[PDB]
Amino acid sequence: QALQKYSTDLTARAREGKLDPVIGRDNEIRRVVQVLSRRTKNNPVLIGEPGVGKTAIVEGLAQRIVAGDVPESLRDKTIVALDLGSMVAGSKYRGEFEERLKAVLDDIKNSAGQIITFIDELHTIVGAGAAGNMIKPMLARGELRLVGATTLDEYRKHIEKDAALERRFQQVYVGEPSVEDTIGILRGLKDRYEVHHGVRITDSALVAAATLSDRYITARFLPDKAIDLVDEAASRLRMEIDSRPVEIDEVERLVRRLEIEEMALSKEEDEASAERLAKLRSELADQKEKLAELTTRWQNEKNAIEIVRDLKEQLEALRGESERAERDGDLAKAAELRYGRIPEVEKKLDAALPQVMLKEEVGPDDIADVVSAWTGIPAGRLLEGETAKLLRMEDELGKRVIGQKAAVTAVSDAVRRSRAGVSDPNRPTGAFMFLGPTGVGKTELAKALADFLFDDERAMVRIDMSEYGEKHTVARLIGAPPGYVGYEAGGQLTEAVRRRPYTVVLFDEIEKAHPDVFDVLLQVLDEGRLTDGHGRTVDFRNTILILTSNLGSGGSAEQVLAAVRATFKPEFINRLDDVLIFEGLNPEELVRIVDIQLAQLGKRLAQRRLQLQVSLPAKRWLAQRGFDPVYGARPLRRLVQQAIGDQLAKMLLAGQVHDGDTVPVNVSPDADSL
Amino acid sequence: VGAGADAGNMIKPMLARGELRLVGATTLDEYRKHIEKDAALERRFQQVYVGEPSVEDTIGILRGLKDRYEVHHGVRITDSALVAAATL
Numbered sequence: 178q179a180l181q182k183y184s185t186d187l188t189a190r191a192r193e194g195k196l197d198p199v200i201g202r203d204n205e206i207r208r209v210v211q212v213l214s215r216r217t218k219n220n221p222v223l224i225g226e227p228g229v230g231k232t233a234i235v236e237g238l239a240q241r242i243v244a245g246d247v248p249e250s251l252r253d254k255t256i257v258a259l260d261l262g263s264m265v266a267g268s269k270y271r272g273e274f275e276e277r278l279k280a281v282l283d284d285i286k287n288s289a290g291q292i293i294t295f296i297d298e299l300h301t302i303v304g305a306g307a308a309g310n311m312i313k314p315m316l317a318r319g320e321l322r323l324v325g326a327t328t329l330d331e332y333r334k335h336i337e338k339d340a341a342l343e344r345r346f347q348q349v350y351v352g353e354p355s356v357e358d359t360i361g362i363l364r365g366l367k368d369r370y371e372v373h374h375g376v377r378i379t380d381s382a383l384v385a386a387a388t389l390s391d392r393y394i395t396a397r398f399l400p401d402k403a404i405d406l407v408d409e410a411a412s413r414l415r416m417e418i419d420s421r422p423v424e425i426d427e428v429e430r431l432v433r434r435l436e437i438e439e440m441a442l443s444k445e446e447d448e449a450s451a452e453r454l455a456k457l458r459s460e461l462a463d464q465k466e467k468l469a470e471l472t473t474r475w476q477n478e479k480n481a482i483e484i485v486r487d488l489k490e491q492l493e494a495l496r497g498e499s500e501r502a503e504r505d506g507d508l509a510k511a512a513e514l515r516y517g518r519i520p521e522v523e524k525k526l527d528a529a530l531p532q533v534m535l536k537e538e539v540g541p542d543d544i545a546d547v548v549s550a551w552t553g554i555p556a557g558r559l560l561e562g563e564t565a566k567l568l569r570m571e572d573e574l575g576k577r578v579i580g581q582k583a584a585v586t587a588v589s590d591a592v593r594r595s596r597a598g599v600s601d602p603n604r605p606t607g608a609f610m611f612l613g614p615t616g617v618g619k620t621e622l623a624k625a626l627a628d629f630l631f632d633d634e635r636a637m638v639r640i641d642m643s644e645y646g647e648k649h650t651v652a653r654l655i656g657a658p659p660g661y662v663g664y665e666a667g668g669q670l671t672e673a674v675r676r677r678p679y680t681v682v683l684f685d686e687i688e689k690a691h692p693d694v695f696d697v698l699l700q701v702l703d704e705g706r707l708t709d710g711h712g713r714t715v716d717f718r719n720t721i722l723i724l725t726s727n728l729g730s731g732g733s734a735e736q737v738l739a740a741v742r743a744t745f746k747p748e749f750i751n752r753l754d755d756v757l758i759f760e761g762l763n764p765e766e767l768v769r770i771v772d773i774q775l776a777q778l779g780k781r782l783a784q785r786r787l788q789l790q791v792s793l794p795a796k797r798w799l800a801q802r803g804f805d806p807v808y809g810a811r812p813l814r815r816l817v818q819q820a821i822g823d824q825l826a827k828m829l830l831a832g833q834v835h836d837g838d839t840v841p842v843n844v845s846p847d848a849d850s851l
Numbered sequence: 852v853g854a855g856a857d858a859g860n861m862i863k864p865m866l867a868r869g870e871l872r873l874v875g876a877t878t879l880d881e882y883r884k885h886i887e888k889d890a891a892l893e894r895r896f897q898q899v900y901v902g903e904p905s906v907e908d909t910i911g912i913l914r915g916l917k918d919r920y921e922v923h924h925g926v927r928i929t930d931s932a933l934v935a936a937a938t939l
């Protein structure tokens with residue numbers, strides 16, 4: 178009675194069909210049976226990584242027994258799964274727990290060879306005492322079966338430490354299934370999710386949800402890292418087929434919130450607030466417009482679907498009538514229906530029939546959208562709005578960087594070549610090095626690129642190679658070996674990519690580092706991974722590595738290349754993408770930097786409503802004064818500051834330039850007045 | 852992970868079957884220190900990365916929360932101040 182009291186049957190649940198299909202894994206069940214029905218050491222223990230499927234095999238064996246496909250001496254066994262969590266509970270006296278264990282063991286002893294005990298998470302029996310050692314006597318006679326399943330490391334962490342027991346067990350290895358076996362298991366399990374949710378599931382989806390989740394989720398194992406995607410896409414589609422679909426359910430909520438905020442911002446007795454109120458209304462209206470446009474779209478197709486349906490119904494009614502005409506022998510209506518009314522409505526149906534958005538089944542891209550919500554990595558289809566930004570990318574980078582089209586092109590052509598699903602999948606999404614004279618942009622372009630993709634300049638992982646001067650500093654970006662002072666901290670680079678692996682990495686002044694920090698970027702590049710202290714393996718197959726330097730600084734093109742081939746390894750300059758070289762600024766190009774800097778300054782002193790008004794000779798002199806062709810565009814910034822900001826501050830903190838003003842600037846013989 | 856002395860371990864069966872719904876919240880760098888050690892457990896969990904907002908939306912959050920403090924402290928708060936309390 179103790180068995181039915183504490184433990185729980187498994188074959189009884191199998192009889193009610195409460196288990197899931199167990200597609201595949203015949204070799205492992207064969208091995209488990211041929212080990213279980215042995216004479217001695219009749220105790221199998223399943224060993225495998227978490228997620229490979231280790232309880233599923235035992236459920237499959239239970240199904241096989243209840244079906245009757247097992248060898249001779251395995252008929253009507255009634256496998257039982259223990260529960261020590263329920264066994265040791267409220268047994269708060271000296272002689273209760275071991276007594277209950279003795280009772281269970283004796284009730285198992287009674288049944289000669291029927292009961293096949295099963296313990297999931299076998300490692301829980303190493304303690305449980307204050308005991309748990311009343312298993313060696315029974316296993317010393319082969320009186321139990323006791324199939325168990327644990328993970329790989331907990332085995333050597335809780336059992337191998339007790340090498341007496343490990344002698345009495347027989348190991349079975351369970352490796353992860355490959356992509357085809359995973360597709361098979363998914364095609365087997367599709368039905369249960371189809372019935373639990375309320376939607377259909379195609380097969381191209383079951384193929385994509387297996388080929389993707391092996392490439393992107395590099396932390397789990399197939400039989401579940403593939404199931405999760407489908408089981409999330411199904412629920413998303415059910416929620417969509419409920420009240421209004423996604424991409425409307427967000428615009429509506431943004432519009433309502435904007436209306437609420439404006440309804441109380443309007444009643445403000447201020448002047449600073451009177452200008453921020455003039456943009457709130459603008460955006461609210463410009464989004465009301467989009468909500469209206471989107472609403473009509475989904476509202477129609479809706480009607481079209483209903484039309485089609487009606488036409489189907491009508492058709493069928495006529496078909497039923499042609500049957501009847503033949504039942505009644507009515508020729509007048511017989512063919513009138515059979516080649517008149519029926520094909521008439523059929524054609525009408527067919528004409529409306531082509532009538533996307535929320536079709537009614539999880540396509541091959543809902544899985545991709547789920548994977549994109551996961552891991553932040555976007556793998557979609559260039560949904561007709563981003564394919565315009567990815568064409569204006571160059572002209573848009575031209576808003577912050579000027580000139581250097583030779584580099585802006587080779588930077589842009591490294592993103593579309595990955596969006597179009599073309600570039601190699603085992604290499605970073607692009608890793609190339611800038612080098613040239615100082616003050617040209619080789620750091621500003623990396624910032625402009627890292628903002629084109631995230632809209633916040635601080636979201637790029639950044640490490641300065643000017644500190645890593647010796648070997649022993651390499652451990653700063655990889656963590657520390659096992660068992661040292663700083664070990665619960667991990668690395669500094671690695672940890673910024675193991676979370677949100679879509680960032681953009683920037684190595685500043687690569688040549689200032691010790692030529693052993695170079696020796697880890699060898700396997701960073703051209704393979705896209707490295708191993709930190711804890712043995713983990715992060716994956717750079719989606720990052721965009723960028724490197725800057727200042728080598729040579731004087732050569733046309735061959736002296737800088739000589740410096741590179743002398744200070745870099747051939748097997749390290751052989752892995753990179755195009756090695757771009759910048760040109761330098763010209764007396765013409767400086768005006769388009771001058772006006773950018775002046776707009777920057779106007780935006781800076783704009784929180785106090787203090788816009789400027791610059792003159793044409795002012796800009797021309799300001800560009801023709803600071804130009805020297807050795808320090809790039811920094812002297813221009815210094816000159817702007819020293820020539821405008823100091824006079825402006827002198828005038829400002831002496832009154833007379835109070836808030837809400839606009840001062841004009843004009844040229845005097847050498848300096849410029851205000 | 853604690854409570855033991857075989858604890859937070861009797862919940863592994865019920866988790867993998869979806870019986871009890873679980874909703875949690877742990878800071879980003881104690882996860883990898885107390886959970887990812889036990890990958891047998893963190894398999895059962897679905898991660899939801901929560902990135903920090905920007906100033907333009909912090910403005911909105913403050914505009915919504917203003918009235919909750921207006922009542923607590925018997926004062927009034929300017930929107931030109933709710934903007935500065937985020938830009939600054």
Ligand SMILES: Nc1ncnc2c1ncn2[C@@H]1O[C@H](COP(=O)(O)OP(=O)(O)OP(O)(O)=S)[C@@H](O)[C@H]1O
Nearest residue numbers: 198199200202227228229230231232233400401891
């Ligand atoms: N061969 C298979 N046939 C059908 N479903 C499978 C198969 N292998 C795995 N699965 C499914 O994939 C999941 C596997 O989860 P489990 O095997 O219970 O995890 P586990 O293998 O027990 O790992 P631990 O150590 O218990 S965390 C379940 O949802 C199973 O239904």
Ligand SMILES: Nc1ncnc2c1ncn2[C@@H]1O[C@H](COP(=O)(O)OP(=O)(O)OP(O)(O)=S)[C@@H](O)[C@H]1O
Nearest residue numbers: 577578579614615616617618619620621727810811
């Ligand atoms: N091509 C450019 N376009 C716009 N601003 C630029 C450009 N080159 C330099 N600047 C300005 O100069 C600063 C950026 O200097 P950078 O050239 O990026 O420094 P750097 O590229 O790291 O060069 P070094 O050799 O490392 S000092 C910012 O204040 C920019 O406004």
